[PDB]
Design a protein around this nucleic acid. Structure first.
Lengths: 131, 118, 119
DNA sequence: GAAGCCACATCCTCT
DNA sequence: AGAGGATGTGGCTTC
């Protein structure tokens, strides 16, 4: 059971998803024990590779992200939608609910905003093998 | 007692004195030069009689079973905290790598002279 | 072998002590078990955080799935969760796309770990 | 007072 | 001689 029946309901009811819908604070969790310089380069280069590690600071919920359809991509990893900024996007199946992560990170501060918007497509089509 | 070493390093009676502050206190005491002393190179020092230093450390901490073997494990814990480092290849030689000049108010050259270290 | 439900309908994990010392090896190895089918070799990862520590430092938090089981060899929690607070675990199975299973109030990590009263 | 954080003190294994 | 892992112990502070 890769997903749960109440897929659309769980995302609209459950408090876990509720708090992660609003544009709340996010941050790059990678190599916190390293100089700020090295963290910056690591985060951008890995972003180009289509992956990163961000957490919703306020709640402390960590997530490992992969910006790909389902190297790099187009509307999955934006590095020009704003000088010094980086827009990212990555789908996944969080607690049996297809969702998509959208947010941005200040290429210098290594933090920003993000959220989880339900994924009508993947969710729906995930009922293929599910039935 | 050329200077208030322990005090200049942060010791204010609050809780036990820490091992590095204690060594610093012995290093600013002319009496102790026979078993512990500056080597003359920056903040490098040598425990010429490690047992005596251990013994005093034990007495000061009230741990009668304290010996060099155990005092040095305390020193090795300072490597990562960048307070004291080992001088490779020189038996019983270590070195303060924290900013003692700011803490003490004196440079190595000044302190070695004040302590008449030859 | 005494598993427990995660916040995902497709994954279970072994039992973790409620309180533990940071950087100390766990009493029982951590394991993530897949319900549905997951390809051997699939990487599994573990992360942790909360309102007091957005991302706890961890050791050996990576494992590979084998016959439905991702067994972490010596997972340790180095970062602390705070007085009275537990960490929220985020388990990630790197399939296509990645599947994530959380686990709230999983474990409390302090500098001492559990200790008998003092007197 | 319990339950946190600290800095060791003890014991060891390995080179 | 020396490095560093594992884990217990007492002083002290914060909840």
């Amino acid at each position: 059971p890769r997903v749960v029946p109440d897929q659309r309901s769980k995302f609209e009811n459950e408090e876990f998803f509720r708090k992660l819908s609003r544009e709340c604070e996010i941050k790059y969790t990678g190599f916190r024990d390293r100089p700020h310089e090295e963290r910056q380069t690591r985060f951008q280069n890995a972003c180009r590779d289509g992956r990163s590690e961000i957490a919703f600071v306020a709640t402390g919920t960590n997530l490992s992200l992969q910006f790909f359809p389902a190297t790099p991509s187009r509307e999955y990893v934006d590095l020009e939608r704003e000088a010094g900024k980086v827009y990212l996007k990555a789908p996944m199946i969080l607690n049996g609910v297809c969702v998509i992560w959208k947010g941005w990170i200040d290429l210098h501060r290594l933090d920003g905003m993000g959220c989880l918007e339900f994924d009508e497509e993947r969710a729906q089509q995930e009922d293929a093998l599910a039935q | 007692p050329v200077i208030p070493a322990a005090a200049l390093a942060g010791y204010t009676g609050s809780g036990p004195i820490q091992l590095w502050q204690f060594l610093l206190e012995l290093l600013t005491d002319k009496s102790c030069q026979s078993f512990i002393s500056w080597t003359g190179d920056g903040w490098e020092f040598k425990l010429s009689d490690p047992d005596e230093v251990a013994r005093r450390w034990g007495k000061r901490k009230n741990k009668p079973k304290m010996n060099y073997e155990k005092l040095s494990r305390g020193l090795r814990y300072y490597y990562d905290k960048n307070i004291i480092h080992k001088t490779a290849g020189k038996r019983y030689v270590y070195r303060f790598v924290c900013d003692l000049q700011s803490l003490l108010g004196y440079t190595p050259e000044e302190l070695h002279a004040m302590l008449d270290v030859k | 072998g005494e598993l427990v439900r995660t916040d995902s309908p497709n994954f279970l994990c072994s039992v973790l002590p409620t309180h533990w010392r940071c950087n100390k090896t766990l009493p029982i190895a951590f394991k993530v078990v897949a319900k549905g089918d997951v390809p051997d070799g699939t990487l599994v990862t573990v992360m942790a955080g909360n309102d007091e520590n957005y991302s706890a430092e961890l050791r050996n938090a990576t494992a590979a799935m084998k016959n439905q089981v991702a067994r972490f060899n010596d997972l340790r929690f180095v970062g602390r969760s705070g007085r009275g607070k537990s960490f929220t675990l985020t388990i990630t199975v790197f399939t296509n796309p990645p599947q994530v299973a959380t686990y709230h109030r999983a474990i409390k990590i302090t500098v001492d770990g559990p200790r008998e009263p003092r007197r």
